[PDB]
Nucleic acid binder design. Sequence first.
RNA 1: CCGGGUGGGGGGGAGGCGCCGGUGAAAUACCACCCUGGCGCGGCUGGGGGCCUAACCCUCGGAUGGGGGGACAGCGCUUGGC
RNA 2: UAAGAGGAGGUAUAGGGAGCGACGCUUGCCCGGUGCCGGAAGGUCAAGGGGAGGGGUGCAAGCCCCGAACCGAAGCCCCGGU
Lengths: 71, 92, 199, 49, 228
Amino acid sequence: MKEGIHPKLVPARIICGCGNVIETYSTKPEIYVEVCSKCHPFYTGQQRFVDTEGRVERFQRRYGDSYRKGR
Amino acid sequence: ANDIQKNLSDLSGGEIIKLLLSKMLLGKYNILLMDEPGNYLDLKSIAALETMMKSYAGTIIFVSHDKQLVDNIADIIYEIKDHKIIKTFERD
Amino acid sequence: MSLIIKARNIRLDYAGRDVLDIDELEIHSYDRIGLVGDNGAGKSSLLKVLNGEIVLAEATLQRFGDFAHISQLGGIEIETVEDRAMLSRLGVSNVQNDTMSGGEETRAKIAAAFSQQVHGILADEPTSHLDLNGIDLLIGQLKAFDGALLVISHDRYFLDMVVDKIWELKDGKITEYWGGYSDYLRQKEEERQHQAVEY
Amino acid sequence: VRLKLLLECTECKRRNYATEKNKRNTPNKLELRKYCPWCRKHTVHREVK
Amino acid sequence: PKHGKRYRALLEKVDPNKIYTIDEAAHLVKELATAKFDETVEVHAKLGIDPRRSDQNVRGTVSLPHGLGKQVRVLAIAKGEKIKEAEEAGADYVGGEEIIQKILDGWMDFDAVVATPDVMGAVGSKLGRILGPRGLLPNPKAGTVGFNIGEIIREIKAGRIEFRNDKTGAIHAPVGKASFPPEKLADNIRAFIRALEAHKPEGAKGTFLRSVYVTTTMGPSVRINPHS
RNA sequence: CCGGGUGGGGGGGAGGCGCCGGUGAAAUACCACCCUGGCGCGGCUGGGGGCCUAACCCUCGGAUGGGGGGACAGCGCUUGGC
RNA sequence: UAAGAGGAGGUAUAGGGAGCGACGCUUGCCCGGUGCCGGAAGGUCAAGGGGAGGGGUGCAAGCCCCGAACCGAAGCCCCGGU
Ligand SMILES: Nc1ncnc2c1ncn2[C@@H]1O[C@H](COP(=O)(O)OP(=O)(O)NP(=O)(O)O)[C@@H](O)[C@H]1O
Ligand SMILES: Nc1ncnc2c1ncn2[C@@H]1O[C@H](COP(=O)(O)OP(=O)(O)NP(=O)(O)O)[C@@H](O)[C@H]1O
């Protein structure tokens, strides 16, 4: 795997399908779509000190790795 | 033709002038004494009135508002400046 | 700009044809809506309903702002105050009720129109029969007092000086667009150049 | 159905209607007649819709 | 500049910065209003209402059992035995339909009117054109029309007053002298609070009991809060 | 909207108006909570414009040295239109 | 499939796409429609920012759902070009 994280692991996927909106007022909404898709996380690149690595995902910067550079 | 049966009370409200204007254009006359023709007539009816009043047989007068029938139909503009000074004219 | 009225589902059939079409109307404060056009739209009939001249027996109107009124066909009964307040430099003063005829009482039937937090004006013709001095004595002071309106008239002399946006109904159309140049934006008849590039 | 209408008359005291036809042009004056509802009195209804 | 007034040493003492109480500023106004002849205190309040809406236009009174003196000039509208009760009780101006006809003629000397219900149809029809919305008019549940007119005047010498909020909500209560005791007229202003909140209508939004101030009518005085 | 009010600095060497008098629909001072009012104070802004550099982008015969770019762009979820 | 590779270790007298096909004489008239480019200023329209007012229960403070005055792009309409 090379879209996992170092403190977590996330490669998910979905399907998608679109129709109408008018539902409490009118007939019902149409449904003519079904297409499989994919829904990626965020890439990051970082450097702190003697310059290693890490690729965390956009909300575990302020939560995750500042403890491990607080040792 | 739809609405030829209505009372006076519940009428156009402002169309009275249009109905009264046609009443005097029937009947055999020589001099007309009109006070504000074009009271509630908006623009399209006041365009209808301004095309006849320079094409008339006898003489007419009109004692009305300024600026749209004056210097287009008017020929002598009498004016009462002070108390009782009706001699004062405008426009020839 | 809080609301006043939320009139909905208004329709009238006096002469067979529809006076008013199905709507859901709305007026709030800080507004100066003018009205225009037509010869038999009953814009004054319509005006009657907002004040409370009639009932419709179908509508579920609500109102909490109190209004004024100016009629279109009539005079008015006696309001004679001792040691007179703001009519000595305003239009006509105390006069007998036998001479009042013409552009003498239009300033008197609006002389009751300036009182008591009146929060809006429902006019139907302000400037009947009154000439140039009564114009500048109206428009100089009609713009004074704040609040929502709905003044309706027949020529854009003072209607360009005071109005921010203008309505026009053509069998109940509640189109709304910005005032002064309403006889200049009605060249959407020119986008009916189709029929001459489509046939 | 150009000039004819589907009108639906209600009471001078109460609820729902009694479903008839009208012309809208040669009469105009908001018709009214007399009928027997399900409260048994033979009252007069009015053109309400 | 700095114009200079006799009220300069007065408002070195009443510095308008803190929210003064009844009792602290009451003893302060005891020593403060110590110019020429005795102060006549009338605590006003300006209520945060829409007074042109008559569902929230409120007035009333409460009966305050204390000794008092020169304040509200009250027309008693009454007939014979109620008139004798009022004249024993200490009425400023007594009367009935005759004095109704007198104020209809030309004579004004009163601030409040109380009326006995035997002639109240005449006081409600006849007195409207001159009394009006001035602070003077009859009201049925505002301590104005009622059979206890003797109790109204008998207490006036100790307590009674009567509300009316004028244009923006301005309402009065006689609650003091140039140094009157505090407890007493403190009881006066506490039951003023109780009666105001008793005839408090539903239309409260925000600070209903909005603003509180002893302006009196015309002369020397500075304001008061009735909370403490 | 004539007069004048509103606000400061004066030329210094018992003083003026306010009381009284006056006048009439009110009468002279002056403290007035909170409301209408137009200028200011601590500031305040959806949006628009400047340069700076400890995010990152691209390149420098040994490259946290140096010199650029600059919070653009690139990238992730998401609305509308070809 | 994100990295990467051909363009090219080339830099507008170079590189992609479309059409007529040496040489000689020449390639006229239309911008109404369609496509492409340049648009001052304005007309409609999406999520999002907002909270006027109204609805359900509860001893009450409160907790739940609609909501719309105004502000918010590309594309279209309108005005000129080829
Ligand atoms: N009560 C009524 N009875 C009969 N017809 C009516 C009534 N009210 C309105 N109408 C009709 O509806 C139309 C509009 O009425 P009206 O109120 O006069 O329009 P308006 O907007 O006032 N225009 P104007 O007449 O020029 O002031 C008229 O042409 C009438 O024929
Ligand atoms: N019954 C009457 N008694 C006395 N004077 C009268 C009477 N009727 C009319 N007048 C006079 O006529 C005048 C009224 O105006 P009028 O003579 O109608 O001119 P007008 O231009 O029609 N008025 P307007 O159009 O309202 O500006 C007054 O100045 C009176 O002196």
